[PDB]
Design a protein around this ligand. Sequence first.
Ligand SMILES: Nc1nc2c(ncn2[C@@H]2O[C@H](COP(=O)(O)OP(=O)(O)OP(=O)(O)O)[C@@H](O)[C@H]2O)c(=O)[nH]1
Ligand SMILES: Nc1nc2c(ncn2[C@@H]2O[C@H](COP(=O)(O)OP(=O)(O)OP(=O)(O)O)[C@@H](O)[C@H]2O)c(=O)[nH]1
Lengths: 439, 453, 243, 311
Amino acid sequence: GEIITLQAGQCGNHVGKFLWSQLAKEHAIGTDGLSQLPDSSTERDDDTKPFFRENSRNKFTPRAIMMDSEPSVIADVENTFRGFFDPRNTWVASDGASAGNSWANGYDIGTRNQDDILNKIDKEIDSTDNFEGFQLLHSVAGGTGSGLGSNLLEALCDRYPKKILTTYSVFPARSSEVVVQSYNTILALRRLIEDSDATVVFDNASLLNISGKVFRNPNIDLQHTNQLISTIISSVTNSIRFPSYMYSSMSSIYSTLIPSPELHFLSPSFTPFTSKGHSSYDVMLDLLDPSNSLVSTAMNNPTYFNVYNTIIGNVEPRQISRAMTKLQQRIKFPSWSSSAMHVNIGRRSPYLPLQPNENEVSGMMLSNMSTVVNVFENACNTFDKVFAKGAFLNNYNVGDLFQSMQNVQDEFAESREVVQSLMEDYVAAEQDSYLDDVL
Amino acid sequence: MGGEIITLQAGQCGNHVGKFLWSQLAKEHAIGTDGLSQLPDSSTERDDDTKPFFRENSRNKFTPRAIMMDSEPSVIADVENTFRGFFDPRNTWVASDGASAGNSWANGYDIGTRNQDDILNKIDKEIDSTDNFEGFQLLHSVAGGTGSGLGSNLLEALCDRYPKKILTTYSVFPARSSEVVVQSYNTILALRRLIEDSDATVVFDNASLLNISGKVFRNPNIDLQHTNQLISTIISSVTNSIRFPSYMYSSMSSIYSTLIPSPELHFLSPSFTPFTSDYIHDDIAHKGHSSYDVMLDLLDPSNSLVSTAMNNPTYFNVYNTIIGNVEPRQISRAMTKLQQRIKFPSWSSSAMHVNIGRRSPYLPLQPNENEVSGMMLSNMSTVVNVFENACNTFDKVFAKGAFLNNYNVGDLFQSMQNVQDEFAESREVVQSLMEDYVAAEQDSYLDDVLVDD
Amino acid sequence: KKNNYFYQKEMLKSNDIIRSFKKIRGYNPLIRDIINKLSRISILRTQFQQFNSKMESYYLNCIIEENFKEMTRKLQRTENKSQNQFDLIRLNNGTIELNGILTPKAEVLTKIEKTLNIDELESVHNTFLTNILSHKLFATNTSEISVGDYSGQPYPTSLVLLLNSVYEFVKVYCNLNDIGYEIFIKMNLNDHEASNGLLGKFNTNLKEIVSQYKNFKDRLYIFRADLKNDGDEELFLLSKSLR
Amino acid sequence: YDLINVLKHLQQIFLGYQSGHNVLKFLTKNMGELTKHYRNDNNANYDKLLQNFELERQSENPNNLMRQLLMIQFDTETLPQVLSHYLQIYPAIYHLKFDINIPYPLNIIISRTCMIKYQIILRYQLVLQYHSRLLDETWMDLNKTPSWKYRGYSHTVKRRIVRATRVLHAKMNHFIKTIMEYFNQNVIDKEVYSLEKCYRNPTLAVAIQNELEGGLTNIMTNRCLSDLIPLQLQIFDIVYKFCKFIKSMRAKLCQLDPQEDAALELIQKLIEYISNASSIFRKCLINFTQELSTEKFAAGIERVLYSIVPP
Ligand SMILES: Nc1nc2c(ncn2[C@@H]2O[C@H](COP(=O)(O)OP(=O)(O)OP(=O)(O)O)[C@@H](O)[C@H]2O)c(=O)[nH]1
Ligand SMILES: Nc1nc2c(ncn2[C@@H]2O[C@H](COP(=O)(O)OP(=O)(O)OP(=O)(O)O)[C@@H](O)[C@H]2O)c(=O)[nH]1
């Protein structure tokens, strides 16, 4: 049941720091890690065990490991959270600052210093007994981050074949570095198709757009984006952190959301929130509306395969039934898959300071539709264009990728082939002829 | 079965370690530096027992049952001036022979054999001053040639002077030697007598000592005094089982019975958690560790005081002593976790041993994070690599015979051929020791008696 | 304590005699195998003494745990009370009952020390003694105890048998040490020219020691199986540590 | 006496209110013991299960009087057997139960009929959670086993066997989890809310007890449960057949991974077996749909209908 957080790259470190600060403010742990709750009442309804290890001092150390080739962000996180994280759970590869935004250098650093990461994860696993899997948070744009993520994914799939791996991949936005970042993105996507178990997609462009829409200042900060990532991760993990009757593990959530391992990419959405005023019917209507999704839809009517929503707040059944009927009327499901719609009422944290816009019930929703395939096609098309038009990727490589550039081109062609097979499987599942082999 | 133990400080490092150990014991038993016990003599109810280590002349003074022997009078005078009235001036041996004429083992052996009468007379006087005796604790300091020679002479005298006493020795090995040839010669000549006569021998490699002194301390510069303070703390922790009598282990013989399976295998490997009685011991309440974590640290190679070089290490006798408020359920959990992680021989069904001691009521109480400390002693064949470095140096330099003009003087052999034959015999005996160790590492060691009765 | 003292006496005698061999052996090529066999028998005796000391330490640990529970909770009951205001009774069918009435949580409408006298102290000492006696390993020749499987003998009976076997082992080791001292005196007298009868006696005593060790290992494996099949977690841990 | 804490503790123990994590951990720790006790006879020793339960109770905080007094036992009858004994319905699995010995003066309020109702509700919730755990374990195996997620060598059987079994498991999930959510939302949650709101400035403890008994009676007489039991008795056997088929397929995949016609014949037998099983399950689901439509109960009913109707 215990899940270990993995913060890869500076983006991973930032989102991990934000998530741990949010969880501390929720469960009353604070920045010092000590139990901010009185020692007179031990009855609690939350579950801090899978995320926090309680020591003899009643201090809750977060079960997270930071793997990054840039020790500056790790030192900054340590300075901001002195007394919160464990110095033994810090991994900087002892190689200095980062160098090179390619997947090759990241994977080479991972393969070189894999022994330290292996010993760290083995110690973290042996510290407890009940284990379920691992949690990664990274961005495929960063070369070192994608390389470290692929290395740890390979290590996990060839070491623990029984633990489930979930990751949160932040795709890059429409920018200029995508001419070289797309290589790392498609390599990490091939790794996800090969070995990963679950992935939650994020589009940086849509994230910045939603940030500018919800914020008063149009100058959106990467810290604000990381805070929104913290909020969406907290909203999706509230069901596990406060289990009451139905949902007590991510295994059931992934069973009811992911129908097959070939389709293990989920698009999140969450509304409303700040960083009574909206009824649950309006909240679920906004969730269905594309203006509240954390990923660029770019589709008039996507083919919904599996959806699952968690409502946080006091709700009544009539509005839930009305919104369910409206969703069954609007959302289209294939004629070969089930039209399942799952709703989970998540309890609020009484040890969490009151969020602005009090008494406003909110809702998160995870979907498996044709919105991620658009971003996949855009990324693969950009990669194909840059590869077939300019042979510049053979100038920045490390190790085996630098010993010969033909193997790099072969690996990239194989990545293009596997992502093409993935999008073909997706567009086939979109059609009714996908399940024709049994009917 | 409990008897008194007399301390033998030998060499500069040995005298420093003895002084640090006696200061630590005085701090633990509230004796202080002035020799006069800081506690009033009216409170005769003492949970500890200073009799095995402190001779009680007056009701408030406790003279340590120790004898210092060194050729350099400066360190002895400094120790005596620092500990005014604490040490016994009659137990200080210098022989007025001046400074040591080199770092050769032959010089120390000669300075021991010449003044053997004085040291033996002092030992007889110290033995007559007491009634119940069990054995001596010698500080060889094999890194120094004169100290190693003096220790070898003391051992060669005590073995046939008191054969009914068990002898333990502590050999401090350096990390990187300046004169590698001379230091390897001295260490091999000392290990010869250690295999010959010494009943128990505990090694102390300086590499792990410097590593721990750089890790747990804040100052990057390492000083020899607080370096020897670690060995002092180790000796105090291993003698705690006799100072504060526990319920299972209360005598050095009973302690060594479960640690020495045979007189040939008399080399151990120590390990200790981050200390709490050293100088910089403030950074201990931030770890938040339990007895299980203490056992894990004891079994970790980063806390061992000798160069581990663990390549599937074969264990023979693993023992641990935990001092503080220990929990039996946590001890059982740690044992269950370690029995599935420690390599055990298929021919011996003996498992690891756990002992629980008592904390001093006058020592500064530590917070609940590091209030409980632990010590581990393992009969591992990893010391054969530390000895293999020296024997490889011997094999690569002995083909020419360098530095032969230093070991020829002092000793009973003045010719080159006799010294060469002695060095060859010592190389042969250490090779046979290494062969016995690598054979005991296998299952055929016990099968030798099963195949033929 | 008699068993432990005899083991320690044999150990010190063997250590002294081996030290004497190492001192005045010289070269002695014919004594190498004899010294190896002596070291092997010393290792066997060390394993025997380690098992005996482990059993004694386990018994002393249970005794001192009972003593600590008596001092901290019965001799010092009024000081640092256990705070367990709920008094429960366990039955053979696993049913739990509440003893007497359930007192409120100190809530009286309001708008010194609980020490034990003579008879209470005597009764609590008697209950402590009965709790010490009621241990399964101490319940010798009782009908309430269950015998070990595949053995037909109770656990204290098997322990007494093991004590008798290790005492016979100590005796035959003393005989072997006497034979070894005689061989040592013969080697001091002549240089491997006599003592053939003493060598034969040493060989026969070594064979007897090996057979006794095999029988004791079989009995210890049987006792381990009994402890594993009894079901008690303490016996399970003891069997795992002995194995 | 803290009656609010007492009711919270009893809802945590018997109703699973805010305590699903503990019972899920207990089930995951005693998966093999429970199934081996249900497959064996009464001669099977449950001493290991009793030791696990008592050590869990000891590790539990002593302040929870209800959890510290919770006792475990085995009944010689099954849950459908006791349901048919207590009601006018027709029926060696699920022989475990729990009980609380209500002391004085709490026994004059907490009688034994409410205790039996709590035991029945706890056994039903335990059956539901055990089936959900079996389904989750089957899904985890199917999604984490390389022998299952591996394909190639001109399979032509992947979309026929693995895809069919995954669709069947998805349907079983969209049925079981949906009905569990409907129950825990429209019965359990409503009763918990009423039991939490009734004691606001109370007037009669006898009235509070009568309201509690009426809520328990409504829970027991809810027509969704009475209509599901005759169909759940077959749904459980269908789930058992499904997981045993999954186990056989997992044991056969490692041998089928690469030459003879015997392997093709075994594959044909397996596919016809699983297709007949899927058809029988579809017919049973159609029968259950007809039964629930004939039953006069409706938001959660419509949700369950939309979840069970095939595309
Ligand atoms: N949203 C967000 N993305 C970030 C943040 N920090 C880094 N990133 C990601 O990092 C990418 C830019 O590359 P870098 O920041 O240099 O990351 P990198 O290439 O792995 O280099 P290093 O982090 O130093 O290892 C962007 O496309 C982002 O996706 C952050 O704070 N917020
Ligand atoms: N680690 C450590 N080593 C010491 C210390 N004191 C002496 N040594 C060892 O001593 C060696 C240097 O020689 P000396 O200290 O003069 O020893 P010596 O040559 O035998 O001279 P004496 O000890 O006076 O007889 C070094 O290689 C050290 O290994 C000490 O305090 N700490």
